């Protein structure tokens, strides 16, 4: 009798649950919970989790939550109760409590079940965006590294701003970068001799600082203004086309990048920045054609030939044709022997080697970059990330990225990387400190929303480690 009456009452719950008679089902589960022989250590957690299932059908999310908590207190590793409690939290907008319960579920399922994984990812994205927008409203307009700004403007050839705003140009060539906005803002409210391009220099430093909302009116004016040099109109459409890609608006981005190639068809910068975008969007065939148009306009360039070779590698590698992949690999050595001082030739080749698991050769190519430019902090980061792939030797991975952070303490890619090493070492408080050092260097909501997903997963595993 003692167990049999409770088992019978459970099945009397199940028949009414199958009938959709959910109130009568809840009464039979409540009978089972009242009748249970607790002195026999009966698995009462199952009666509570069964009762909780019916309250989803009634959509009383507080009742399904508290009947799952009863099951979890009796039985702390019971996945059904933890996942049902997570769904109830999501419906109640208890997103943090959902994340902690789903983190325990992912761990106890060995990350195998993709229903749990989808709820984790959704709730992390929502928690990420909520934290991101509140911080991004309050960020510093933090100027990036001088090595970064010189590397940035070295991307634009066919541009009156880069080549030689007239007050502002002095501070570019003297590298007093934090003055530039102020001068452009008084060279506007004047004649088109200054105004028509002071707009676009100002818009460029707003983008570099991550202030994209202030960039968009200075770009929109330069398109609208008819008498301004056609190369400024094309250059402004590269910068609007890029701004729309930070906003993840790919149709509006593509419209501008096409208008640039219609408006100024003999302009390498338009095809260069289109080519680099199309290969990140994985629209590989359009990237190769736009890089080939860079070589046609700049045939002496080492960088343009390195980039077209990487584009043919990515085209072969999004295929599976071994002959084409191997031909592309030899293509980088042909580039290196023609251009033995091309640091981006070695860096792109090292990434083709990294991707083909040729780690020991890839490592030499990263050494060659250090010989050619000791100030290039990101090579110690590409050499550190290689350690995390090259039989995962995490101990020396810290030492490399510590040297990278010592060369350039504004390399957010270095801090974000070392955060993931501290995660693999289980050192979650220092991982969260590394991700916070990366968050203080982000240029967009889209980046902060990604770094806050990492901090919240690190917190959730810290709270699951107690349990």
């Amino acid at each position: 009798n003692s167990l049999d009456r409770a088992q019978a009452a459970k099945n009397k719950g199940n028949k009414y649950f199958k009938a959709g008679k959910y109130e009568q089902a809840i009464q039979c589960y409540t009978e089972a919970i009242s009748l249970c022989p607790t002195e026999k250590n009966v698995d009462l957690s199952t009666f509570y989790q069964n009762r909780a299932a019916a309250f989803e059908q009634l959509q009383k999310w507080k009742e399904v939550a508290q009947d799952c908590t009863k099951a979890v207190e009796l039985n702390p590793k019971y996945v059904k109760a933890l996942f049902r409690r997570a769904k109830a939290h999501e419906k109640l907008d208890n997103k943090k409590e959902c994340l902690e319960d789903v983190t325990a579920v992912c761990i106890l399922e060995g990350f195998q079940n993709q229903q749990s994984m989808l709820l984790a990812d959704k709730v992390l994205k929502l928690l990420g965006k909520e934290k991101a927008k509140e911080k991004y409203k309050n960020r510093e307009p933090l100027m990036p590294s001088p090595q970064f700004i010189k590397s940035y403007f070295s991307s634009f050839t066919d541009d009156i701003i880069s080549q030689p705003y007239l007050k502002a140009k002095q501070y570019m060539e003297e590298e007093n970068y934090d003055k530039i906005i102020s001068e452009c803002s008084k060279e506007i409210d004047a004649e088109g001799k200054y105004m028509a391009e002071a707009l676009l220099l100002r818009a460029t430093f707003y983008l570099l600082i991550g202030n994209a909302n202030a960039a968009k009116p200075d770009l929109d004016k330069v398109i609208s203004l008819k008498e301004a040099n056609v190369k400024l109109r094309a250059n402004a459409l590269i910068k609007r086309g890029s701004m729309y890609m930070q906003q993840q608006q790919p149709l509006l981005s593509t419209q501008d990048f096409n208008m640039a190639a219609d408006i100024d068809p003999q302009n390498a910068d338009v095809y260069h920045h289109r080519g680099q975008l199309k290969i990140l969007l994985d629209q590989v065939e359009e990237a190769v054609a736009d890089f080939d148009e860079c070589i046609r306009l700049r045939p002496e360039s080492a960088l343009a030939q390195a980039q077209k070779c990487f584009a043919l590698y990515r085209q072969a590698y999004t295929g599976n044709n071994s002959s084409q992949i191997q031909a592309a690999m030899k293509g980088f050595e042909e580039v290196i022997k023609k251009f033995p001082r091309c640091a981006e030739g070695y860096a792109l080749y090292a990434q083709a080697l990294t991707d083909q698991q040729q780690f020991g050769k890839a490592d030499e190519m990263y050494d060659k970059c250090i010989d050619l430019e000791p100030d290039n902090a990101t090579t110690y980061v590409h050499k550190g990330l290689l350690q995390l792939q090259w039989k995962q030797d995490l101990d020396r991975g810290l030492e490399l990225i510590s040297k990278a952070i010592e060369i350039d303490n504004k390399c957010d890619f270095a801090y974000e990387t070392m955060g993931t090493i501290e995660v693999q070492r289980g050192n979650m408080e220092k991982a969260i400190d590394m991700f916070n050092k990366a968050i203080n260097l982000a240029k967009s909501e889209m980046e902060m929303a990604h770094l806050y997903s990492l901090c919240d997963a690190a917190h959730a595993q810290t709270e699951v480690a107690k349990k």
Binding site: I107, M245, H273, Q276, E344, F413, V423, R425, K443
Partner: protein, 38 residues
């Protein structure tokens, strides 16, 4: 696999943008390959 936004760095070497496109996958495995999870 998972899918992520195309988080462009502005006017950066293409090798750095392809490296951020990789670090998203090492971040994904970092929380599974840790002592708390094992």
């Amino acid at each position: 696999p998972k899918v992520y936004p195309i988080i462009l760095r502005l006017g950066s070497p293409l090798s750095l943008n392809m490296a951020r496109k990789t670090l998203n996958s090492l971040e994904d495995k970092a929380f599974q390959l840790t002592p708390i999870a094992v």
